[PDB]
Design an enzyme around this catalytic site. Structure first.
Site, short mmCIF file in Angstrom:
data_model
loop_
_atom_site.label_atom_id
_atom_site.label_comp_id
_atom_site.label_asym_id
_atom_site.label_seq_id
_atom_site.Cartn_x
_atom_site.Cartn_y
_atom_site.Cartn_z
N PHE A 111 -49.23 47.48 16.76
CA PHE A 111 -49.64 46.62 15.98
C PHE A 111 -50.44 45.36 15.85
CE2 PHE A 111 -47.49 44.03 12.57
CZ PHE A 111 -46.39 44.90 13.56
N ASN A 132 -42.77 51.34 14.01
CA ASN A 132 -41.68 52.18 14.21
C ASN A 132 -41.36 53.60 13.08
OD1 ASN A 132 -38.88 49.39 13.77
ND2 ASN A 132 -39.97 51.16 12.08
N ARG A 152 -55.18 53.11 12.00
CA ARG A 152 -55.08 52.48 11.45
C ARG A 152 -55.06 51.62 10.43
NH1 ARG A 152 -49.59 51.01 8.83
NH2 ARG A 152 -49.48 51.38 6.26
N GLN A 187 -53.45 49.11 13.36
CA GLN A 187 -52.81 50.00 14.15
C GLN A 187 -53.16 50.64 15.52
OE1 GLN A 187 -49.88 51.89 11.37
NE2 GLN A 187 -48.79 52.92 13.23
N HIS A 245 -39.97 44.82 13.45
CA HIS A 245 -40.47 45.16 13.60
C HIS A 245 -40.19 43.95 15.16
CE1 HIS A 245 -42.21 48.93 11.96
NE2 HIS A 245 -42.02 47.91 10.46
N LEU A 251 -41.87 41.58 7.83
CA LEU A 251 -41.51 42.33 9.09
C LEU A 251 -41.03 42.42 9.94
CD1 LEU A 251 -45.07 44.21 9.88
CD2 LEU A 251 -43.61 45.09 8.12
N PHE A 296 -53.90 42.60 7.15
CA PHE A 296 -53.06 42.82 6.86
C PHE A 296 -52.82 42.99 8.65
CE2 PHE A 296 -49.93 46.60 6.84
CZ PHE A 296 -48.76 45.52 7.35
#
Lengths: 165, 11
Positions: free
Chosen positions: A113, A102, A55, A63, A126, A122, A60
């Protein structure tokens, strides 16, 4: 002593892109840094080598880490299936930040990521445990193969990985 | 949405 340094040799459909090296903050998040380190050397008999970044969303993050199912639903830690959120000392302050993916509170496994931008929403959700030390240009090249919904246009894999320091 | 979950993707 000194914080551990780990590297990933990234490939696109098998063609070598380059090496990305990360510093792991073992001094602030020892258990989380050790999990990532051990998964990078493959010393427990399983790990990141050969897995893909499933991903990638431009602007951004990138991942990866699902070495069991390769689609975002798998992977596991070196401590069993999942482990708690160690602490939230570090924040997602900018590009190059390495953080744990997660499925809610205390569900860290192997997925992580790499931020390509500041992602403060975040913070506190995270666990941040490292940062890109060298090869940010490689992460940027990886980002070019992502899309708005995360689907990559080409296969981006961790051709090789290990510990440098 | 911009989340990084493992399993059920949200908004």
């Amino acid at each position: 002593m000194v914080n551990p340094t780990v590297f990933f040799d990234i490939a696109v459909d098998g063609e070598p892109l380059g090496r990305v090296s990360f510093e792991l903050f073992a001094d602030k998040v020892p258990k989380t840094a050790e999990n990532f380190r051990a998964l990078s050397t493959g010393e427990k008999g399983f790990g990141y080598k050969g897995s893909c970044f499933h991903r990638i969303i431009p602007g951004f993050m990138c991942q990866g880490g699902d070495f069991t199912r390769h689609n975002g639903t798998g992977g596991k830690s070196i401590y069993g299936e999942k482990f708690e959120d160690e602490n939230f000392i570090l924040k997602h302050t900018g590009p190059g930040i390495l953080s744990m993916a997660n499925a809610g509170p205390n569900t860290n496994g192997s997925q992580f990521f790499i931020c390509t931008a500041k992602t403060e929403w975040l913070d506190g959700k995270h666990v941040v445990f490292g940062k890109v030390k060298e090869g940010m240009n490689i992460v940027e090249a990886m980002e070019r193969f992502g899309s708005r919904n995360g689907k990559t246009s080409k296969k981006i894999t961790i051709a090789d990985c290990g510990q440098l320091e | 949405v911009l989340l990084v979950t493992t399993g059920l993707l949200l908004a």
